[PDB]
Design a protein around this ligand. Structure first.
Ligand SMILES: Nc1nc2c(ncn2[C@@H]2O[C@H](COP(=O)(O)OP(=O)(O)O)[C@@H](O)[C@H]2O)c(=O)[nH]1
Ligand SMILES: [Mg+2]
Ligand SMILES: [Mg+2]
Length: 166
């Protein structure tokens, strides 16, 4: 099997844990401990290839562990998540990307911009705003809901396909 090492980054409360849990367990969590930072594994077939996903769900900000740094340094691709009803989290994306570029010493890192909570009414961040940001980075933009599952497979599987182009 090929293994793909994925790291999920973004502001607290955007749904990084909910997205990972949805992908792995097919269930939506209302209140997952916001400090739990751990890795999760899933065997999936993507485009006819059986592979293993090794996903680090990052927590808790302005902090670094041995595992975090390892996945950050050895992560092959990054989901950069914001919530479409959280303007600050969208504005924060720039910092996560700058961080990733520094760790990787590269502006060419497999990455997907994820606008999560698309089930919630009256977004404060427009799709076209996020499209314009992702275009400036040279990366895809995908909207998701950890609640309904909309886009969740699409985001993680696209990141896998980005890593494959690399
Ligand atoms: N309505 C809705 N709520 C979500 C979604 N994703 C996460 N949440 C909620 O947002 C809050 C933060 O989610 P969490 O996964 O802990 O965010 P994290 O800090 O980035 O890991 C929780 O109350 C989740 O139930 C979503 O797609 N839709
Ligand atoms: Mg979390
Ligand atoms: Mg506005």
């Amino acid at each position: 099997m090929t293994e793909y090492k994925l790291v999920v980054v973004g502001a607290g409360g955007v749904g990084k844990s909910a997205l990972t849990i949805q992908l792995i367990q097919n269930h939506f969590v209302d209140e997952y401990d916001p400090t739990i930072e751990d890795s999760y594994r899933k065997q999936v077939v993507i485009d006819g290839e059986t592979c293993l996903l090794d996903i680090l769900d990052t927590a808790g900000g302005e902090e670094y562990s041995a595992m975090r740094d390892q996945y950050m340094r050895t992560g092959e691709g990054f989901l950069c998540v914001f919530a479409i009803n959280n303007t600050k989290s969208f504005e924060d994306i720039h910092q996560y990307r700058e961080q990733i570029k520094r760790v990787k010493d590269s502006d060419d890192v497999p990455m997907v911009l994820v606008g999560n909570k698309c089930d919630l009414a009256a977004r404060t961040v427009e799709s076209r705003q996020a499209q314009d940001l992702a275009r400036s980075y040279g990366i895809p933009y995908i909207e998701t809901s950890a609640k309904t599952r909309q886009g969740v497979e699409d985001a993680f599987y696209t990141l896998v396909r980005e890593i494959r182009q690399h």
